[PDB]
User: Fold protein (lysozyme) from Enterobacteria phage T4.
Amino acid sequence: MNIFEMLRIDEGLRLKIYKDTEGYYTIGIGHLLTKSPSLNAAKSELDKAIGRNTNGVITKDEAEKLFNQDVDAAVRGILRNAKLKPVYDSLDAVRRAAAINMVFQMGETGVAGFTNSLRMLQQKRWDEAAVNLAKSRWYNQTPNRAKRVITTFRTGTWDAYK
Ligand SMILES: [Cl-]
Ligand SMILES: [Xe]
Ligand SMILES: [Xe]
Ligand SMILES: [Xe]
Assistant:
């Protein structure tokens, strides 16, 4: 197990434009295209992202390409954020994958908003972090996923993904 396999399980793979759990236009392995309700706006951003007129459909390699850029970008954003980097650097490998999953799903600002869990994580107070993490809209809206990531930070193992 690694970050790519983990997110691939959490996000799935769809080759045609689809609406995510929040109703926003997405494609591939959770690649958000736009928050606009407009499918044309979506198609436009897709074509711009892939570099060709896709007509709202992409290939598996194109989906994987977007995914590689998206993971890279998530990592880079954590490293650049002064509130996230110190926590991230203090963690072990497995738990860093959990931090990446969260940033991929909710963004750097979103995660950086969990001040209390971030400190608990930095202190290596696992069960406590796990409890605080669940006190969130994220957990109430996507409980199954939130539970897998939480258990990952709780345990430092990939058991929830097995
Ligand atoms: Cl879920
Ligand atoms: Xe983090
Ligand atoms: Xe985090
Ligand atoms: Xe977090």
Observations:
- The two ends are 9 Å apart (CA to CA).
- The beta strands are 14-19, 25-28, 31-34.
- The first strand starts at residue 14 and ends at 19.
- Residues 84, 87, 99, 102, 111, 118 surround xenon (ligand 3) (CB under 6 Å).
